[PDB]
Design a protein around this ligand. Sequence first.
Ligand SMILES: Cc1cccc(-c2[nH]c(CNc3ccccc3F)nc2-c2ccc3ncnn3c2)n1
Length: 304
Amino acid sequence: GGTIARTIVLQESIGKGRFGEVWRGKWRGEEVAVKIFSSREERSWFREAEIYQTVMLRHENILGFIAADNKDNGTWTQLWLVSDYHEHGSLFDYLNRYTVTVEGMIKLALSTASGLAHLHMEIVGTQGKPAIAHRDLKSKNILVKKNGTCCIADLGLAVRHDSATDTIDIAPNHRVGTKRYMAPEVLDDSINMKHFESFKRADIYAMGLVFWEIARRCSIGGIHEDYQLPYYDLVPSDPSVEEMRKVVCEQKLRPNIPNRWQSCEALRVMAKIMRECWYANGAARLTALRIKKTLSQLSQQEGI
Ligand SMILES: Cc1cccc(-c2[nH]c(CNc3ccccc3F)nc2-c2ccc3ncnn3c2)n1
């Protein structure tokens, strides 16, 4: 028999994502995460397996993929994805549970930007990597490792670019992803989904929102903000496209940047990155690579 799902024992239910359910399991004595899909979710399982098996994808700031597998329990077939397990769980959970130091904030923001720059970057060569856009980046889809750096997960809605043709490997539907984090051009459906660069730019808007969630929890002299999701002050829980579009597109509002973030070079640089992710025009936003460079220079100056 097989060497993966056959030998893994599920221990603890973690919860349901877009499709399937995540568990903590044990494999050769080691904790692993397992995402289990049913037979009628095969397209979702296959596509996420396909993205994670992309040549040259592995990176410290992308969730470490172990395998795709099947497991037949005697009644039905389960479709498995197996990954590294991170005890802290999501950035969303971590930021709810904890405050961070200036060092902690920069590590979380730099590691996220590094993972997104790696996803976005085409690597040339025989073992080349296509450019990839995420399409559902949010704090619930980022994990915090024991070393206090992040890695990006839920690659199931990702799209891959063929640079030679400027074409994408699937036919994208409109307004996939989490409505709270949707870029203005996604909410008003103006995005040109035939241009791969548009999907990169939409990811940058979402990463800006995630940076705002992190910076709220950066405690200096015991001062910090409470955990909130972006737009907690303007839209209902589980907002509709229309509710988001009225706020982000029509009223042109973004998450508030507290006066406190001007007091501190690290928070000033973070706030400036947020503003330069939040432009209505995607073409004006920072690249992940530029954000990585800026936070790398800030990491150096603060001695992390
Ligand atoms: C490819 C694969 C295999 C196993 C888990 C995940 C995964 N997919 C998401 C997407 N997000 C998500 C999902 C469900 C419910 C809720 C959510 F936000 N997270 C994780 C994950 C991985 C590792 C880990 N370690 C501790 N938790 N944990 C979670 N991917």
